[PDB]
Ligand SMILES: CSC[C@H]1O[C@@H](n2cnc3c(N)ncnc32)[C@H](O)[C@@H]1O
Ligand SMILES: CSC[C@H]1O[C@@H](n2cnc3c(N)ncnc32)[C@H](O)[C@@H]1O
Ligand SMILES: [Cl-]
Ligand SMILES: [Cl-]
Ligand SMILES: [Cl-]
Ligand SMILES: [Cl-]
Ligand SMILES: [Cl-]
């Protein structure tokens with residue numbers, strides 16, 4: 001059997017770019033909870049002992065930006081200089097242009113709202129996992145989630161918030177369909193405290209993190225482990241290392257699989273086609289596979305600023321479709337509503353008070369079962385033949 | 386003939402994210418010109434009347450960060466509040482952690498330098514253009530370059546620095562090979578002054594920008610034009626609209642084609658595998674096509690922090706290879722040196738004083754003929770059959 005190697009990575013919630021994604025989305029959730037019609041373009045950056053929130057917000061909400069920044073950093077575990085940021089003592093620069101909505105006298109609907117911007121977005125799904133995501137991505141991501149879980153529940157209390165994971169999967173190509181064979185290489189680089197030796201780190205990473213996440217059927221005697229390969233990782237997060245919102249867009253999506261149109265997600269209100277557009281084409285691709293029309297699917301949509309209808313749509317099944325891609329294109333366009341005002345309503349994205357977007361801003365926007373992830377709910381599609 | 390629609394976009398040099406890419410790379414070029422061994426991780430952000438440079442630099446160079454920021458903004462055309470930023474009067478926050486190199490007493494080589502970080506990078510090429518790039522991307526990009534050129538040379542002196550472009554191409558799939566048929570839709574949204582009417586804008590965009598860029602063979606009576614579809618665009622750049630380094634990674638690469646591993650380019654010294662890794666796999670994919678082994682090619686490499694040899698390589702020819710992909714993989718691994726210390730030397734990326742990286746930070750890193758773009762030079766490869 002001829003195989004190939006495909007790699008995906010992940011970063012932990014304490015990675016300084018991901019910290020900025022989560023702060024940007026916590027700000028957005030706090031605006032939506034009071035004012036579902038908030039317009040939010042909230043950018044975060046960070047460096048040693050500093051966070052700055054900036055960009056533009058129109059809302060009726062009353063939001064304590066500084067407090068959201070501090071609460072988000074503290075819940076991640078950034079509780080002191082030693083761990084890489086003191087939530088309680090660090091400089092927080094509040095640099096948002098805040099506006100209340102327009103006040104007007106006399107003088108449209110969701111169907112006719114133009115896109116807020118131009119751009120293009122891709123959706124992907126594959127039958128290789130139950131969540132219809134690529135294995136390389138799913139295992140990298142779940143190793144990062146697991147690190148956060150065993151730190152916080154005290155099973156590995158030596159851990160610190162920052163770190164990175166990476167998984168190389170050996171695949172077979174069955175006529176366009178991706179058949180994962182085995183895990184070829186596992187890389188973990190995790191922040192940690194000064195108590196723990198290199199040998200305790202390696203042992204706890206194998207037993208408490210790798211073994212519970214990666215199915216035994218994919219691991220064998222030839223799988224390569226790199227555990228903290230560059231030595232000690234005591235200093236982390238923003239300390240000596242700048243973060244920005246929107247710098248982990250491939251970890252937020254498909255790990256190198258499918259495609260990306262370039263738009264970041266976090267800190268954007270869900271009327272923005274970069275977010276609502278990407279979410280609906282995930283639901284489309286996922287619904288193409290789950291209904292049995294194909295084993296894999298890629299969908300692109302594109303927009304013009306001020307135009308409601310998409311400029312272009314396309315479907316690619318990598319020759320796995322059981323009916324022609326032109327027909328799947330027709331069924332996608334018939335079943336899904338790509339108009340920006342309608343996508344936000346149909347995926348119920350403005351509904352407040354469940355920390356929905358803060359949930360998406362670590363460990364991926366796709367492949368999760370959480371009921372706030374409305375784009376992960378398969379639409380039944382009619383097809384035949 | 387069955388066809389499909391594929392969209393790519395571009396943003397102009399005055400777009401506030403792209404402004405941050407260029408400031409980050411101008412800082413890097415100024416460090417390299419004096420000290421080729423500079424370590425540079427220089428992040429830029431911008432909002433109304435402000436730029437901030439931040440991140441981390443170790444160098445022997447003497448660099449005037451504020452002056453680089455002002456000179457870069459001024460050369461773009463940001464000369465007043467009205468145009469969207471005053472290069473001469475705006476706030477510039479210099480927030481870099483600057484270090485001189487380590488001073489040490491007594492006690493390696495390029496072959497053994499470990500990667501500076503983990504990650505994965507993709508290279509793509511296609512025979513559909515002379516520059517072996519996707520047409521959608523090449524036409525979007527060249528419409529943006531043209532806007533900048535007719536502003537600055539005074540042919541359309543009503544233009545302002547900001548703007549966006551987008552091109553939908555109608556393609557045929559010849560057995561894996563992309564055959565562009567026609568341009569389906571052209572979108573231009575350009576900043577402008579208060580003199581010019583909507584009709585003069587539309588007329589000058591068709592005659593001075595579209596007609597010179599897009600070959601007549603691809604344009605017909607059914608091609609859709611969207612010219613400033615959302616009305617007037619007088620305010621632009623950072624004014625009312627935040628920019629960050631590394632937010633246009635798909636415009637920097639392949640416009641949705643091929644794949645992306647997630648790493649931004651700008652503000653990073655070329656020892657960083659995100660940059661040197663991506664550049665060499667562009668040269669690999671481009672060399673696979675140009676030598677005639679395939680019509681299209683995708684190459685992935687991946688790294689572990691502190692490990693010199695890549696964790697994984699793969700080649701995909703989309704079934705256009707004239708010899709098996711496993712054999713092309715073998716010829717790529719034999720001909721190219723993926724070790725981080727060797728890639729920087731082989732592509733001569735530390736050589737200073739030609740504004741090399743500032744050139745890459747607008748209108749794409751790939752498909753340009755400029756001799757500083759060493760990754761665009763095809764390597765002769767031995768193959769046969
Ligand atoms: C190379 S430093 C940049 C990134 O790599 C990771 N990193 C930082 N320090 C270390 C280390 N000592 N070992 C491994 N990875 C690290 C962190 O998540 C950081 O965001
Ligand atoms: C939607 S505003 C965000 C981006 O869209 C573009 N833009 C800003 N104002 C306008 C406008 N009036 N018409 C079209 N595009 C715009 C700019 O390049 C900006 O970076
Ligand atoms: Cl403060
Ligand atoms: Cl308003
Ligand atoms: Cl939008
Ligand atoms: Cl400790
Ligand atoms: Cl450390």
Ligand SMILES: [Cl-]
Pocket residue numbers: 335336337338346
């Ligand atoms: Cl829908």
Ligand SMILES: [Cl-]
Pocket residue numbers: 368369370
């Ligand atoms: Cl979940």
Ligand SMILES: [Cl-]
Pocket residue numbers: 475476477478
């Ligand atoms: Cl100043």
Ligand SMILES: [Cl-]
Pocket residue numbers: 443485486487
């Ligand atoms: Cl040093």
Ligand SMILES: [Cl-]
Pocket residue numbers: 500501502656657658659
């Ligand atoms: Cl690196």
Ligand SMILES: [Cl-]
Pocket residue numbers: 578579580
């Ligand atoms: Cl004017």
Ligand SMILES: [Cl-]
Pocket residue numbers: 617618619620
């Ligand atoms: Cl305007």
Ligand SMILES: [Cl-]
Pocket residue numbers: 720721722723731
């Ligand atoms: Cl080489």
Ligand SMILES: [Cl-]
Pocket residue numbers: 753754755
């Ligand atoms: Cl050029």
Ligand SMILES: [Mg+2]
Pocket residue numbers: 017242243247
């Ligand atoms: Mg980063």
Ligand SMILES: [Mg+2]
Pocket residue numbers: 402627628632
């Ligand atoms: Mg932006």
